[PDB]
Design a protein around this ligand. Structure first.
Ligand code: J1Q
Length: 148
């Protein structure tokens, strides 16, 4: 389910910062692989997230517009797994930031916007491209390459 993968992902990100989410908490290997891929994405692009956040100026009034803007740029050159990982980690980072700015009402909204975008705009692609199992396979190949 699209709701479930978003929910597990967001739950994990918030739990990483000690935040337990009222509405929170696909194979287990899929969730685990997406968790690691997102964590590596954040490690590499930490500085970029910090700069982008500053540009977006998160508020309840502008959160949806910022979410839509980011996602439109992310997928401007089409969908691939790497960009889907970016998507998840962007939604995660935005949920952590919401909580940090005493805007925790946004977490539920961001999770809904993520699940909707998955449903309306990534679902076809995912299925055409072998589903979440293909993501796991890709991750494996890349891990073996990065090892050697
Ligand atoms: C995490 C989603 C960032 C999407 N974005 C910012 C939109 C601001 C309105 C992008 O410009 C964007 C577009 C693409 C294809 N991507 C990437 C996808 C995979 C790997 C890197 C990028 C990328 O282009 N960047 C990574 C990143 C991460 C966090 C914050 C901003 C950016 C932008 C660039 C930085 N070099 N990021």
């Amino acid at each position: 389910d699209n709701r479930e993968i978003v929910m597990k992902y967001i739950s994990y990100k918030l739990s990483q910062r000690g935040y337990e989410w009222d509405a929170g908490d696909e194979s287990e290997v899929v969730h685990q692989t997406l968790r690691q891929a997102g964590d590596d994405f954040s490690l590499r692009y930490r500085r970029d997230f910090a700069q982008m956040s500053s540009q977006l100026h998160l508020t309840p009034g502008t959160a949806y517009a910022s979410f839509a803007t980011v996602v439109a740029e992310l997928f401007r050159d089409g969908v691939n797994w790497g960009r889907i990982v970016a998507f998840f980690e962007f939604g995660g980072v935005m949920c952590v930031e919401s909580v940090n700015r005493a805007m925790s009402v946004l977490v539920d909204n961001i999770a809904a916007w993520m699940a909707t975008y998955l449903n309306d705009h990534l679902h076809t692609w995912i299925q055409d491209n072998g589903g979440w199992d293909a993501f796991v396979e890709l991750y494996g190949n890349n891990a073996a390459a990065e090892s050697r």
